[PDB]
């Protein structure tokens, strides 16, 4: 009789030393070479990863009864925190979902700022050996850890602070005290002791900075402490002369009448901070979602609707291909969300943000009152890879930085359309053989 887990360690699934932590997660369908290095939820929750006490899931959709089953046995009835954001009826069906499981409770999430959502994405494991923090890209329902392509940045195991002592445990990067703003914003009684076991651990090792959206009005220099403005202060202050802006999403915004009310000036302004850039925006094509891994359905969670894209069709030009060669997801639509800076010849990197934030202004912030305040209706969370955390000035791409897609990006061709989800394509069949009629 052996111990089952008897020559298995984390480092079957982790890659130990590697500075970035950056994982995709496992997709189902592919040839196994494209899941080595993966992760699945179950990976990151197994008994390998620590040995559990408590956690808490920040997230936007979720499947409670699927969401319990990626917990190992042994731990399903440890207290588990679901922080959403539904009101009413989406509220009172959650907490029809959690009943049944009693060691889970719900935190809502304020949205006072009209149409904004629960959108971050992470993870806090309590275990008795330290806390990990997890924040990554995938809803907790199976659909989006199955034919997906997700991102998941993971903490070391930071250890706790012992009792009687006393140390900042933060990192260069002021991982912890941004951490611990970004959760103090949601003034929840229910994260209070969420925020002190923060307090408690030793987050020194931490080497990306936090990128939050949180809902609100900031004036003044609190305009520097979320979404585009906290991006853009970073880049001042921790990061290159024609070197492009990538930006790759699963759902567009209303950006305004044209490029100039807020793409090109406030956002693209921001993210070529560092210290006639060209722009490239990669949204999946009809044609990427139709020979997709599960055909025009993969559409159903790439919500750019008709109504919003005909009053933007100038953005369109922006537009490139979802190719993923490199890691073997090219028919896996993307669900991740990434803004990287990289050299003319593609061949680095100036920085890399994988995030929860769509290409919105609810997520990324509009200024308003003659660019005095900076208005934000949605929760978001990213992490962002800056060289200089390394002692690097830039990264090489493939010190090596995992870019999940293809460089360079691939404009769409004459024949190919961005996603819209609400309208029907009716001329060529998916995948499956289907075709695809909303309503």
Known sequence: LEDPGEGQDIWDMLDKGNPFQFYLTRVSGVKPKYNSGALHIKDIL???????????????????????????????????????????????????????????????????????????????????????VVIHTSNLIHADWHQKTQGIWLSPLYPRIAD?????????????????????????????????????????????????????????????????????????????????????????????????????????????????????????S?????????????????????????????????????????????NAMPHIKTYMRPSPDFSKIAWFLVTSANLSKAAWGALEKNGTQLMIRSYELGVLFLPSALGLDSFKVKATFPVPYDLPPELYGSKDRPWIWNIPYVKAPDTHGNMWVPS
Not at 171 to 199: G, Q
Not at 261 to 282: A, D, H, N, Q, R
């Open 164 to 284: 009687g002592t006393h140390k900042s445990g933060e990192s260069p990067t002021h991982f912890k005290a941004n951490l611990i703003s970004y959760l103090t914003a949601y003034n929840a009684p229910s994260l209070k002791e969420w925020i002190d076991v923060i307090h408690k651990h030793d987050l020194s090792e931490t080497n990306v900075y936090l990128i939050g959206s949180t809902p609100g009005r900031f004036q003044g220099s609190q305009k520097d402490n979320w979404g585009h403005f906290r991006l853009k202060k970073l880049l001042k202050d921790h990061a290159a002369e024609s070197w492009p802006v990538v930006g790759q999403f699963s759902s567009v915004g209303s950006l305004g009448a044209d490029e100039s009310k807020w793409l090109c000036s406030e956002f693209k302004e921001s993210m070529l901070t560092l210290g006639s850039v060209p722009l490239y925006l990669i949204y999946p």
């Open 286 to 330: 009809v044609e990427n979602v139709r020979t997709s891994l599960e055909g025009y359905p993969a559409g159903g969670s790439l919500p750019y609707s008709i109504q919003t894209a005909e009053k933007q069709n100038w953005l369109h030009s922006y537009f490139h291909k979802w190719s993923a060669e490199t890691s073997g997801r090219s």
């Open 46 to 132: 197994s008994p390998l990863f620590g040995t559990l006490v408590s956690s808490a899931q920040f997230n936007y959709c979720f499947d409670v009864d699927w969401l319990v089953k990626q917990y190992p046995p042994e731990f399903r009835k440890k207290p588990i925190l679901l922080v959403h954001g539904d009101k009413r009826e989406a509220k009172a069906h959650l907490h029809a979902q959690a009943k049944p499981y009693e060691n889970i409770s719900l935190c809502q999430a304020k949205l006072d700022i009209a149409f904004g959502t629960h959108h971050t994405k992470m993870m806090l494991l309590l275990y008795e050996e330290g806390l990990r």
